[PDB]
Symmetry: T
Subunit: 64 residues, 12 copies
């Protein structure tokens, strides 16, 4: 059985690095992370110092 | 990193109050709740006494 | 077996009351109405006197 | 010909009042506003004092 | 309040049995599981021995 | 001209049999049923005895 | 209250005429038809003599 | 950079002519119109004399 | 088994004729073309002489 | 690089067997078939003898 | 009240830089730009010299 | 007439480079490649050595 958690990663650099940010967090706290599906992307502007790219992913992990 | 939990709140009063019901539950058990996105709304009729409005939300919270 | 009818209710008050308007109509003419799913919402402006909130619902009823 | 502008209204009270907020703004600056279609709803939490309901609408107006 | 977890069940037999696989896992670890909504189906081929049917479900459970 | 009715069939056995349940009902009451399109699938759990698979279909029939 | 019926009109001429075909049928059998929304278009080829354009519409009518 | 404006054109003749109606309006008031994407089609019936076909388009234009 | 190819037809006349353009091409090179489903429509403006209507279709054909 | 072909399989038995029908055809003619994603399901009724279940899949295969 | 404008940015480098291109243009001409939501991405090939990455964003700005 | 092929490119570097990977493959085997539309993005994790970014594109090419 796989389960997915819905995470939004952030980066001041790129959409790819923002996806990595979310996956890194998942891998910190979950075993058997196997894939991620991008579900949205955006840019936070008017409450940060530098533009912040955001990539939201369903991160899938194998249960057990 | 933000994470979202997918909650359906309920109310005998309104769709807005049903959204509040879900957010209240999130705030009871989670720190740093920052926003909610409505993903569906409906009304339960034929297994309740009074119509029950339901509002399903992705409730976003900042991790750490 | 359930069947759904696609109804748009209206209200000069709120989206919740517009949903009730549709459900009330279904309950007038149908037995065993069991739930409703919101599929769209809108506001009619430039052919009514007061803004009219509209809520479109699939109203589900149990057949037999 | 109709044109639509994509506006997010806000309210500390309800999704309906947040929709009104957007429509009111459109009517302030546009002639012949004729309808609005709800495209999203959400709640801003962790950068406001009180929860703020938001309703995003395409507000349609007749050109000329 | 209901909460949903996003699970992908697997089966070498059918899409229905793959849905059961996910629900069974939810029922192992959660109380008050009340319904499941199918959100995707697929078949894993080129890293398994026999075709494996997969059914992804939002499994809803009542909180408390 | 074709018309469609939106029916949810149920089965304690499978998603395919739940689709048949809806189609059977359509064929009981309608002439010239010609096809069905699956629009959703789900499983009712916590108000039935055995899991009940549900398949919602637009059932198309030729008018006249 | 408005209700919608989901009709597929057909024409050997055009998508517009296929939409008219559905609306004409609605107007034959329903009072207070007020609008139609196109939901799909297609072309039937390999079971007709000439290509047949099809336009599927939700036809809305005012109840009462 | 391209920008899009969301326009609904109308015609008593066809969906194609309704799309032209919107594009013509864009070209009246905008320079460097480069393409249009159809996003919806419909027919206004019960507040016009003759059926009016409507085609909603995102009309893209190159900025500068 | 059916297979679909994703083709965009073009016409200086209409969306219907643009759909025919794609289907004609499919029929030139494929046997047993049986139906087409419209998936998008648009208009190319700023790199053609006359507006060019485009209709994108999944063209289905029976294999063997 | 992966490529996908869009195939509709058929079965007089089940949606799962209809998916297998499409995958079997892909495996007959393609090397390195690796997965399939269900994109639609339906039932052909009024031009076949027995109901025919259909499952449309994107069948993915690794290029080279 | 927030308003959104629908802009497609371009870059010969990356999808992230194409998003920046659109946001930069918005910030040139608008006050209080607060966020952007990616709605589409693509690559222009056969009318440019080098591949051009394009990222379409709804750029949100606070009115007043 | 344009045709599209549905390709998933891969890269250990970025979503942009994964899109290039797919386009490069199309250009190897097809003439008159004119544009690509991103339809999905993801990251393969638990069967590769380094995270592999994937970008799925419809690659459009002009027929003849
Ligand atoms: C990055 C980002 C910020 C946002 N802020 C937001 N802030 C807000 O008050 N309302 C919103 O709807 C909203 N949407 C956002 C979406 C994105 C993608
Ligand atoms: C409130 C609500 C109840 C429902 N009950 C339901 N009960 C059921 O047996 N099948 C369903 O598909 C179903 N859907 C529902 C959807 C909503 C929005
Ligand atoms: C309330 C409402 C009115 C509308 N009127 C409309 N009137 C019209 O001529 N064309 C339309 O597309 C249209 N859409 C509408 C949508 C909504 C939600
Ligand atoms: C109200 C609201 C705020 C938001 N803030 C947001 N803030 C953010 O940093 N990223 C987001 O994606 C985001 N989305 C939002 C969506 C909504 C509906
Ligand atoms: C079963 C299945 C396997 C998959 N594998 C996959 N493997 C991969 O490398 N990229 C993918 O996008 C991908 N998608 C899949 C989807 C499904 C439904
Ligand atoms: C089978 C089923 C039951 C459901 N019950 C439900 N019951 C409920 O109170 N709210 C819901 O949203 C809901 N959704 C359902 C969906 C499905 C598919
Ligand atoms: C016109 C048309 C015919 C079709 N026939 C069809 N026939 C069939 O056996 N399976 C299908 O999925 C199918 N889809 C169709 C869709 C359209 C739009
Ligand atoms: C042409 C058209 C008119 C409409 N009128 C409408 N009028 C209305 O009161 N409510 C609606 O939702 C609505 N929708 C419409 C949609 C279309 C496409
Ligand atoms: C006809 C048409 C042309 C287009 N050109 C385009 N040209 C471009 O540089 N970027 C685009 O996104 C784009 N989209 C188009 C869509 C359509 C429907
Ligand atoms: C099985 C099937 C047959 C169909 N036939 C069809 N036949 C037709 O004339 N028009 C259609 O739109 C159509 N759609 C279909 C869809 C499905 C899923
Ligand atoms: C970059 C891009 C160019 C395009 N050109 C295009 N050109 C065209 O003639 N028709 C189209 O549909 C089209 N779509 C496009 C989409 C994208 C994303
Ligand atoms: C990269 C990727 C791998 C995947 N693997 C997958 N593997 C699997 O067994 N089931 C899946 O649904 C699945 N989906 C995937 C999606 C993506 C985007
Ligand atoms: Cl989710
Ligand atoms: Cl419907
Ligand atoms: Cl828009
Ligand atoms: Cl496709
Ligand atoms: Mg930096
Ligand atoms: Mg988002
Ligand atoms: Mg914010
Ligand atoms: Mg009360
Ligand atoms: Mg729901
Ligand atoms: Mg129930
Ligand atoms: Mg009042
Ligand atoms: Mg509507
Ligand atoms: Mg009107
Ligand atoms: Mg107050
Ligand atoms: Mg939003
Ligand atoms: Mg076995
Ligand atoms: Mg999936
Ligand atoms: Mg049994
Ligand atoms: Mg459902
Ligand atoms: Mg003729
Ligand atoms: Mg259809
Ligand atoms: Mg047929
Ligand atoms: Mg005339
Ligand atoms: Mg519309
Ligand atoms: Mg001409
Ligand atoms: Mg297109
Ligand atoms: Mg048999
Ligand atoms: Mg289909
Ligand atoms: Mg360069
Ligand atoms: Mg686009
Ligand atoms: Mg071009
Ligand atoms: Mg490297
Ligand atoms: Mg994918
Ligand atoms: Mg895999
Ligand atoms: Na989730
Ligand atoms: Na219906
Ligand atoms: Na817009
Ligand atoms: Na394809």
């Amino acid at each position: 059985v796989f389960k997915k958690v819905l995470l939004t990663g952030t980066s001041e650099e790129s959409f790819t690095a923002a996806a990595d940010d979310a996956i890194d967090r998942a891998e910190d706290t979950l075993d058997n992370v196997v894939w991620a599906e991008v579900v949205d992307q955006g840019v936070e502007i008017g409450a940060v110092e530098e533009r912040t790219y955001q990539t939201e992913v369903q991160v899938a992990f194998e249960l057990d």
